[PDB]
RNA sequence: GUGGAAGUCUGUUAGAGUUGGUGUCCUACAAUACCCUCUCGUGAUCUAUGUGUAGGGGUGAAAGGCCCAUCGAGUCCGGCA
RNA sequence: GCGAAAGCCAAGGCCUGUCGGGAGCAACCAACGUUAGGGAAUUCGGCAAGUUAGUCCCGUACCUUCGGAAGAAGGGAUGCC
RNA sequence: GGUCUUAAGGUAGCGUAGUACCUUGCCGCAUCAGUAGCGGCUUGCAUGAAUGGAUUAACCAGAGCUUCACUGUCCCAACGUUGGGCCCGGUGAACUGUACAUUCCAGUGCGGAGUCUGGAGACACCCAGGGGGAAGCGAAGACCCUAUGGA
RNA sequence: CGAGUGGCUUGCUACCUCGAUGUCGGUUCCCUCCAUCCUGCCCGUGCAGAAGCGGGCAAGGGUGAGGUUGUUCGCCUAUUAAAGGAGGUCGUGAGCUGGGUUUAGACCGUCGUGAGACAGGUCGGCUGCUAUCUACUGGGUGUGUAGGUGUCUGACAAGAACGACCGUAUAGUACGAGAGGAACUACGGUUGGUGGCCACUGGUGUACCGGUUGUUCGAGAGAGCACGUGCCGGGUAGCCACGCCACACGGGGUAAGAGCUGAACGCAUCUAAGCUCGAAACCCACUUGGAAAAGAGACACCGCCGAGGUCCCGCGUACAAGACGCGGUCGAUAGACUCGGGGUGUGCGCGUCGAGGUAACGAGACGUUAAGCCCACGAGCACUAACAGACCAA
């Protein structure tokens, strides 16, 4: 994919637990697998900022719930490197709901967003409110 | 840069920026005054600080 | 089932014993393309700071943007090439025929080596164009030293004494180039070899770490879970199958780690100065205070603070010179909170 | 409100017991130990001393458990080379 | 302090749970502290460790042999002057 | 089958059971995914009434499963603390030992060799280490068979 | 239907061990095989393209994470370039685990008159040893080559030191009715592996500083203990990873394959002689070790009555002993002191205020005070200590 223009330690795992920042309806997703990633043995395959992760539905509308959709990852707690050397941090994990398109699933995104997720997903980008 | 917490300069290259649910930003020059945010304290209370100083 | 997994640490730089020099001693040289010049140079490691430049990069969608890069200093005082030694072609490889030595020494060369106090160096020369009259003659490099009694931040009087090749034009042209420099009294810098922005390698005697176990000198797992409760926290499962029966030394195991020798490729040079611009508040920690040549170079180097690091015009670059690159800020900020 | 029952509860009170750690030990401190954890703790309770039951016999809320580091028949000597 | 509890301290006893000296004292091992982000993905199994915790007020479900379940759960308070 | 063996021929119940071979039975719940667990079905290889059946509040260091919380169990390891370890003075055993012995790769051999054969490698001694081999040490195999053995 | 290869399964045999070669599964760690799952290079196609199917060379590298089950196997999920299979005493218990098989306790079903049994199920049920030899990882002492210092050479040895993917331009292009939809090349990034490093972020930090509970030293001040910090808050250096830096191309020779010239055989023929190309594979390149390479090396200088070295002293860029490296008055090597640079967070005392209280008393607030306390770093500085001196040596 496209340089995110940061750099990025993964602070999610398969398996974790995070917010879903939009209006579709799910509340919680839990991670499933990461798109394009491969890990090593033991290791939990990793997925933070910019990544393009498999999810399914642990809260929300009974309809949206038990779902396994695609989504991307907007925000995380560890810390990530701008060009710059300032790290950036948010005041938690999430990603929104996403389709084949990459077109966000809803129709507004909660909270705010990394703007290295810009350079990768433009419709997601432009259904922002706030871009940090 | 200002640290939004103590005051001083941000040395270049150096500091963390922990963005709020909310959206709003704030710069911190160090994890000394990350931490004594964290702890619910006003920088103006601690008398070290530019900003109380 | 049993998943695959690639085995612990490289097999390529064993095997992992205590480095038989400090000094580093490059295995090859750049190849014989510009004008004659000396192909290599020493310096001190001082310590680590940062760097704003600007996106000097092409192909970056950043080119011409500010940007923090980490940089090492090195302290890198003038050098003295203080003789030409001359290597034959033989069906052995090469042997040192001869060399030109020459009368100017500094103060303290006599605390390594036994200086010359009768020395014939036309003969030398004589021997050597002869040779090379014939077509024996091998590459031309020349013996050189340090001088740490510039480097105050270094404890060390006694010269590192070190050999660097000559690559240049014609063998002819060269051989001249080489006996120019040696005859004036060898004193060269790192200016007239290298140039801010070109790619260099270094090598370096890495930082000791005594002896250690295969967790940390060969990167095996710890035990996990109830296993590490056992007895057993830091050692491997077996040292092999049943058959062969016989350890094989390919088997991580403790052992010295650190101090040893490593040639890290492609390190950029950020910039070639002199003074105190560079210096750290407080002074560079377990160092000191640098004020005199100095070079930046881009990331890390091998070797502890006042360990002596061998430069040398990259062998295999990836990327084409960039000079000059644009430092529009140095941290000077103290290395010490 | 009074009263203060209970093979009642909590409890490293004393005291009794011995679940997990399959930790430490495993030519031991120890021929059954050490530490943490854990169970009971007014009752069919725990305990000292005295006293009774003896080997195809005792004793046994029964596991073939126990009867002096000895038990699907103790120990010693003899039958016996 | 509820306390024959902990912790600290008297009286009284001891430095005899009886080999010492040296190295910032490496690997490795025994006990153990702290670990960012994730939070059982580990494993036969949450084994080990951790969490909770004292007291007062509020409040407390299914079920039930009406005794109980129950300290259910959950919420709040707590110092000094 | 619409009696026959041998007296009767399984009733209330429960049921894929700590009893179900086929078996991961079928359906459902739950999970991204559940040979598990729970519920329903159930022709039960080979359930069933004091050989007690069903069911059950309370109790339990009893067996299985789920959730919240928690966390170095894990991703993936780091740093530190104390006692050892290492060097020095003093004290001072044991296990084990046919002999020889610096081995490695192959082969051979009673078919699982440091010692045979062919090659390869190999200057001696010493320190620390984790235990690959000596079918390592420890125990006249508990399994199995045999004995005109024992209990 | 016929001929075989392997030695992973199962069966057969009874050669080896019953004065014992520790079980299954798992785990950890190392090497290998190819009958190739991915990756490279190719051939055919029912090959338009894209996506495939089948085949050849090829073992360099990769082949991962999870839900049920002790499981091996296998079923299932989401990722993936792909999530290949097999050998090493069914590799691996003087390494771990101990869930299963298969001890002694018990239950159920079936069988038996019964003891008790089961190629049925189920709950519980132990993991010994101080390494003599050998092997390897690292570290020393000697001898050989035959005085010393410094610098090299390179027989050989090791490496995967690099593997792979996504995206952009190419291009909505070639191809195609359309739907759909490439490539060469050049770029950016990711992942796995590899080596090093600590300016940055992060961890530790029983150095240090502060807060505060209980108790003891009469109070205050200042302190001990509470497990080897009482607890809580912050945290320098260092060490670290979760942080950062670096890790080609290109030549040479080949395989499969594509061809050239070309004869046997006037033609034809990629092959028989000759030649041009052509794989992630091979060699070189690059990194690491390497004068004990018995052909035991080379060069320069110093020295054979003196070159150099060991011991000694102050120390670490080094370190388990040993080793290594630096400094030694012609000195900044270590300590003191003073600055600088850092960590805490505003000291004792005194003054004012303070809910109140006759008063006594009074938690606490402000000022003095970026104070007080502290530092494993740097500089200045010969004040202290690197003194004295011993020895070996052609
Ligand atoms: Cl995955
Ligand atoms: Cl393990
Ligand atoms: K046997
Ligand atoms: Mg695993
Ligand atoms: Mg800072
Ligand atoms: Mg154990
Ligand atoms: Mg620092
Ligand atoms: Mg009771
Ligand atoms: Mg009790
Ligand atoms: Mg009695
Ligand atoms: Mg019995
Ligand atoms: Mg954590
Ligand atoms: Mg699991
Ligand atoms: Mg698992
Ligand atoms: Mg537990
Ligand atoms: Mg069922
Ligand atoms: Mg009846
Ligand atoms: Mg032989
Ligand atoms: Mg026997
Ligand atoms: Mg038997
Ligand atoms: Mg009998
Ligand atoms: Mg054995
Ligand atoms: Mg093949
Ligand atoms: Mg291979
Ligand atoms: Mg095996
Ligand atoms: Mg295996
Ligand atoms: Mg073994
Ligand atoms: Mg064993
Ligand atoms: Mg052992
Ligand atoms: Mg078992
Ligand atoms: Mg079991
Ligand atoms: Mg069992
Ligand atoms: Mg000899
Ligand atoms: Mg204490
Ligand atoms: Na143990
Ligand atoms: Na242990
Ligand atoms: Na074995
Ligand atoms: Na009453
Ligand atoms: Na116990
Ligand atoms: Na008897
Ligand atoms: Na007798
Ligand atoms: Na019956
Ligand atoms: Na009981
Ligand atoms: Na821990
Ligand atoms: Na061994
Ligand atoms: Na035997
Ligand atoms: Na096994
Ligand atoms: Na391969
Ligand atoms: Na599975
Ligand atoms: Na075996
Ligand atoms: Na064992
Ligand atoms: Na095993
Ligand atoms: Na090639
Ligand atoms: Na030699």
Redesign the interface.
């Known amino acids: 994919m496209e340089?995110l223009?940061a750099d990025v330690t993964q602070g999610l795992e398969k398996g974790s637990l995070i917010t879903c920042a939009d209006n579709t309806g799910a509340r919680e997703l839990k991670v499933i697998s990461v798109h394009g990633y491969s890990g090593?043995?033991?290791r939990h395959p990793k997925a933070g900022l910019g990544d393009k992760i498999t999810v399914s539905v642990t809260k929300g509308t009974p309809e949206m719930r038990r779902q396994v959709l695609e989504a991307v990852v907007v925000?995380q707690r560890k810390?990530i490197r701008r060009?710059?050397?300032?790290?950036?941090?948010?005041?938690?994990n999430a990603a929104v709901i996403v389709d084949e398109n990459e077109d966000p699933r809803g129709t507004e995104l909660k909270?705010?967003i990394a703007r290295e997720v810009a350079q990768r997903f433009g419709s997601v980008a432009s259904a922002a409110?706030?871009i940090? | 840069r200002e640290c939004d917490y103590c005051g001083t300069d941000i040395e270049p290259g150096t500091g963390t920026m922990f963005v709020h649910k909310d959206g709003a930003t704030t710069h911190f020059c160090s994890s000394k005054c990350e931490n004594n945010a964290d702890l619910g304290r006003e920088a103006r209370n601690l008398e070290w600080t530019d900003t109380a100083r | 089932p049993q998943p695959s997994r690639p085995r612990k640490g490289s097999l390529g730089f064993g095997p992992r014993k205590r480095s038989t020099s400090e000094t580093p001693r490059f295995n090859s040289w750049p190849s014989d393309d510009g004008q004659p010049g000396v192909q290599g140079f020493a310096g001190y490691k001082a310590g680590m700071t940062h760097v704003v430049l600007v996106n000097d990069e092409p192909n970056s969608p950043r080119e011409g943007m500010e940007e923090t890069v980490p940089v090492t200093v090195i302290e890198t005082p003038p050098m003295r090439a203080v003789a030409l030694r001359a290597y034959e072609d033989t069906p052995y490889g090469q042997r040192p025929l001869t060399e030109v030595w020459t009368d100017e020494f500094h103060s303290e060369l006599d605390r390594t080596l036994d200086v010359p106090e009768d020395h014939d160096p036309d003969a030398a020369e004589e021997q050597i164009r002869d040779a090379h009259e014939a077509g024996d003659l091998g590459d031309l490099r020349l013996i050189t030293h340090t001088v740490p009694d510039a480097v105050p931040s270094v404890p060390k009087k006694k010269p590192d004494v070190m050999e660097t090749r000559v690559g240049g034009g014609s063998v002819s042209d060269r051989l001249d180039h080489a006996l120019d420099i040696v005859e004036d009294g060898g004193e060269h810098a790192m200016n007239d070899i290298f140039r801010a922005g070109e790619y260099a390698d270094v090598a370096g005697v890495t930082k000791g770490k005594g002896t250690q176990g295969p967790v940390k000198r060969w990167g095996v797992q710890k035990r996990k879970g109830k296993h590490a409760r056992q007895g057993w926290r830091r050692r491997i499962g077996n040292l092999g199958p049943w058959n062969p029966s016989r350890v094989r030394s390919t088997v991580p195991q403790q052992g010295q780690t650190g101090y040893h020798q490593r040639t890290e490729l492609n390190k950029r040079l950020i910039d070639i100065g002199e003074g105190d611009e560079p210096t750290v508040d407080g002074g560079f920690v377990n160092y000191g205070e640098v004020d005199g040549p100095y070079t930046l170079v881009k990331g890390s180097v091998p070797g502890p603070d006042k360990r002596l690091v061998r430069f040398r015009p990259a062998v295999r670059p990836n990327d084409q010179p960039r000079l000059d690159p644009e430092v529009r800020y140095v941290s000077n900020e103290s290395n010490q909170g």
Do not use: I, L, S
């Not at chain 1, 710059?84 to 941090?89: A, L, N, P």
């Open positions: 340089a223009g090593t043995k033991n925000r810390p060009p710059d050397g300032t790290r950036v941090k948010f005041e938690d909270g705010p409110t706030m940090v």
